[PDB]
Write a protein that binds this ligand. Structure first.
Ligand SMILES: Nc1ncnc2c1ncn2[C@@H]1O[C@H](COP(=O)(O)OP(=O)(O)O)[C@@H](O)[C@H]1O
Ligand SMILES: Nc1ncnc2c1ncn2[C@@H]1O[C@H](COP(=O)(O)OP(=O)(O)O)[C@@H](O)[C@H]1O
Ligand SMILES: [Mg+2]
Ligand SMILES: [Mg+2]
Lengths: 241, 242
């Protein structure tokens, strides 16, 4: 009941990007999403984060129905964090200020409280000493960890990841995946669009393969990667792994 | 008149002096390149000019306005001073087009129709009008940085600050960005550019400032400072990838 989607459809003009998506993710589940570009993976995530609107079907995030009147969108918005492939940081402010901005403005937390918690989070990602540094001095691996710390600072119940390490140098991937695994080990509800097989196998509860606007196949990590049942899945897997 | 005026500017982070007192005067139309080793205060200096950070001593005046003058007119400076960073220039949670129109609409009350109109032209100006409806996660470094520029220009600023806009790009994409900056320069835009791309400096730089440890060690026209450096430290820094 954490994330419930029924026959979701979305189009950009006369190009149908999502052609009827069905997904039901319960609290604590870690769902990995794979598939070629153009399959609507990001669009799907963007819909769950209220960053994009959808045409048909419906979405229910932890009870609250997104297209129902009443509701209150901004409440859902804040219990769902998101980490993108790139960016995620204000280059004009310190690491610390990047993390406390939303908790102060949206949760009206006094600066001292927000910072004490930011420091804690920064410490848990191994970067407490980067607190007063600006984003430019950080490496790709540190920057993405700060970006996760920032999304976590709002204390969300759902964490969305859109290829968080695909743009990183191989050496930087690990430090980022580790934080994600800890987040997984700690029971967070996660949806992760990634092509990092290792991560999927270790903490992924289920893998959904998206292609051409549909979820072509599902399964436990090793079942889908090693025993793909659909022809399209096998073809795509052999182009990546 | 003089666009940027900086009398013995000093900055300290606690008991650690970053800018040991520097003097700079940039007039309307000037392209000043700032080079120097890391940890010399190049970035701190830019953040001061862009009200992003506070300075201890000296004074600063951006187009008449004295940055720390009582009955403030400094948020009209913010709209006149545009800046592009090395990384993190765009919001990934929104489209290209929406990144560019966010400030004009918000800060200057521009009507959605108007804002998106000039935005499309700017995108065209950087060779990316078809990316108007794309998301940042799909662009290349070169493109992303050309869009970041278009974004800052959306506010029609008087001054453009660039903090190593290509230092994080693959050699292949460095060119398209410098080219967009080359263009801004030809059009008479007042610019302060921190870079290590000496070719750009030579071709577009009116003046070059060599910073080292919080001080401006050497100044002068590009060709003179590049070919015939007068100071040892300037020679030493320029010897790294000669
Ligand atoms: N605003 C838009 N207008 C038109 N087409 C769009 C728009 N946004 C995205 N698209 C296109 O629709 C499809 C969306 O794909 P996407 O959600 O990015 O899936 P993926 O994350 O697997 O690449 C792609 O073809 C994308 O380029
Ligand atoms: N918040 C801070 N506290 C202490 N030192 C800082 C802080 N921010 C920057 N510095 C230091 O100021 C010095 C100059 O930084 P900077 O302006 O970024 O130089 P460059 O831009 O030439 O690398 C460096 O030693 C940098 O680490
Ligand atoms: Mg995508
Ligand atoms: Mg710097």
């Amino acid at each position: 009941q954490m994330i419930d989607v029924h026959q979701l459809k979305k189009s950009f003009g006369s190009l149908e990007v999502l052609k009827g998506i069905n997904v039901h993710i319960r609290e604590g589940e870690v769902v990995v999403v794979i598939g070629p570009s153009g399959s609507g993976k990001s669009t799907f995530l963007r819909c769950l984060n209220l960053l994009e609107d959808f045409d048909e079907g419906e979405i229910i995030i932890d009870g609250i129905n997104l297209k129902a009147k009443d509701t209150n969108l901004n409440k859902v918005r804040e219990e769902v964090g998101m980490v993108f492939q790139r960016f995620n940081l204000f280059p004009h402010m310190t690491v610390l200020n990047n993390i406390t901005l939303a908790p102060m403005k949206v949760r009206k937390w006094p600066r001292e409280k927000a910072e004490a918690k930011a420091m804690e989070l920064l410490d848990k990602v191994g970067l407490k000493d980067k607190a007063h540094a600006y984003p430019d001095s950080l490496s790709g691996g540190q920057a993405q960890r700060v970006a996760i710390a920032r999304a976590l600072a709002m204390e969300p119940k759902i964490m969305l990841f859109d290829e968080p390490t695909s743009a990183l140098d191989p050496e930087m991937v690990g430090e980022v995946l580790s934080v994600m695994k800890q987040l997984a080990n700690e029971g967070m509800t996660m949806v992760v669009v990634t092509h990092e097989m290792g991560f999927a196998r270790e903490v992924g509860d289920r893998v959904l393969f998206m292609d051409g606007g549909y979820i072509i196949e599902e399964g436990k990590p090793e079942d889908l990667f090693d025993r793909p049942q659909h022809e399209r899945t096998k073809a795509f897997l052999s182009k990546v792994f």
